[PDB]
């Protein structure tokens, strides 16, 4: 494998490697620069559910930090998001993390 | 089918259905009582990354 599948232990499979890496050694990353940055404020850029599934290390990682983090979405199949960068200056927010293509 | 599973956009097929009620609308039927409920703050018990 190369990317991301999901793989519950209730699965046992044997004969299967991956060449993606860890995330929560990513979030751990992200946790690093974060509090490098000393931030009590994020903001998470998605669209999908599948990145967040992929990135809710980070969606749990403030049990060991108080920080209010914003998490909202992209449009789907149009790529206008400049309503939701209204949205955000509404929102006034600047501490922004960016996955998507 | 019955149980919810994933069924993105780019699955673009189109012989299937399932009679799973659409997580948005129980969200926003949550977002209901919790509107009744007025309330601050939250936490969610919950599973997985399902």
């Known amino acids: 494998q190369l990317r991301w599948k999901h793989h519950p232990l209730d699965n046992k499979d ?3 490697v991956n060449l993606y890496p860890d ?3 990513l979030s751990h990353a992200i946790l690093d620069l974060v509090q490098s940055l000393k931030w009590r404020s994020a903001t998470v850029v998605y669209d999908d559910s599948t990145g967040l599934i992929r990135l809710q290390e ?3 990682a403030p049990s060991r930090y108080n920080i209010r983090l914003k998490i909202r979405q992209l449009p789907i199949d149009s790529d206008d998001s400049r309503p939701l960068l209204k949205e955000m200056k509404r929102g006034r927010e600047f501490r922004i993390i960016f996955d998507c293509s």
Do not use: V
Request: no cysteine; net charge neutral; charged share 0%.
């Open 23 to 25: 995330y929560a050694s």
């Open 14 to 16: 044997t004969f299967y």
């Open 58 to 60: 980070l969606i749990m």
